[PDB]
Design a protein around this ligand. Structure first.
Ligand code: LYS
Ligand code: VAL
Ligand code: CA
Ligand code: CA
Ligand code: CA
Ligand code: CA
Ligand code: ZN
Length: 316
């Protein structure tokens, strides 16, 4: 809508207060004009039609329980936009300031979130497996990172290319979580998964095997479930990324950590300059090595650590 840019206040899924950029035209809409072509948040109203209605509020205060998923989808889309712009000089997911659209209250009891090729979509969860999924900054950033991938490497969502696609979303989801710097970790979805169980998550990057996922290429899944294991085999790449950043010894192979900022630079460059729709794990290794070489030099610690990490997870 056309209107006056303003600032509302609300509470997110976890009960935390935050300011949100809104637009006033009769109602206060969840439309943030301060970032690119805008960030727009919609109410799917428990239906599956998308996007639904641009979120309208009478008083610019978003403290109702029903408001909470919208507040977080809107706010965390803004944080993710800021990460890509400030850290990587990327303007929105297409690099041309495309409008970011999100819908909340998708379906009833829907235990997932996704990028549908055009926008973000968040279920409310069933209250036992998940609470509303936009409460997880890593979840929001994971899904928006699929949009970045769509416009860059375009990794096909099946088998090894698909597992790279997934790992890229977990990596940048996590780096956005660290950027915002509120309870950051190397776990995925911990803020919204299983409200009745403390200390668990959907996936772990530091120890993928904790949730049944492979941490070495020898343990890769080659069945047909989950588009050939895209959320399973992502563990192999997540583990490599974790090792590059944090270091460690894994199956007896030692990796010197280079930190999360350099991890982000290396993987962003690989994603945007070297990866292609059909890239496999071996080709990801080559892309990461080339990226680290460009940024830091062939004799650098950074290049050595990329090689060690991929060696540690059995990817040559
Ligand atoms: N995003 C993961 C799991 C999230 C919710 C599981 N019910 C997947 O789609 O496989
Ligand atoms: C739930 C979210 C993190 C994602 N669509 C899976 O994995
Ligand atoms: Ca209100
Ligand atoms: Ca966290
Ligand atoms: Ca996390
Ligand atoms: Ca939990
Ligand atoms: Zn994903």
């Amino acid at each position: 809508i056309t209107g006056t840019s303003t600032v509302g206040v609300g509470r997110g899924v976890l009960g935390d207060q935050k300011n949100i950029n809104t637009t006033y035209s009769t109602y206060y809409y969840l439309q943030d004009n301060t970032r690119g072509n805008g960030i727009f948040t919609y109410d799917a109203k428990y239906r599956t039609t998308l996007p639904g209605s641009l979120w309208a509020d009478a008083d610019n205060q978003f403290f109702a329980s029903y408001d909470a998923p919208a507040v977080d989808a809107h706010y965390y889309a803004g944080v993710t936009y800021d990460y890509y712009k400030n850290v990587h000089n990327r303007l929105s997911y297409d690099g041309n300031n495309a409008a970011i659209r999100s819908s909340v209250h998708y379906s009833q009891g829907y235990n997932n979130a996704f990028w549908n090729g055009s926008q973000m979509v968040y279920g409310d969860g069933d209250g036992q497996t998940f609470i509303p999924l936009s409460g997880g900054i890593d979840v929001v950033a994971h899904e928006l990172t699929h949009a970045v991938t769509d416009y860059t490497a375009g990794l096909i969502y099946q088998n090894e290319s698909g597992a790279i696609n997934e790992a890229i979303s977990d990596i940048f989801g996590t780096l956005v979580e660290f950027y915002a710097n509120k309870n950051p970790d190397w776990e995925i979805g911990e803020d919204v998964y299983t409200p009745g169980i403390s200390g668990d998550s959907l996936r772990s990057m530091s120890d993928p095997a904790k949730y049944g996922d492979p941490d070495h290429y020898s343990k890769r899944y080659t069945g047909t479930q989950d588009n050939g294991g895209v959320h399973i085999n992502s563990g192999i790449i997540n583990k490599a990324a974790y090792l590059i950043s944090q270091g460690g010894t894994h199956y007896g192979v030692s990796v010197v950590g280079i930190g999360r900022d350099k991890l982000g630079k290396i993987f962003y460059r690989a994603l945007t300059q070297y990866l292609t729709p059909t890239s496999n794990f071996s080709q990801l290794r080559a892309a990461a090595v080339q990226s680290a070489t460009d940024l830091y030099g062939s004799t650098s610690q950074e290049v050595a650590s990329v090689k060690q990490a991929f060696d540690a997870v059995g990817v040559k």
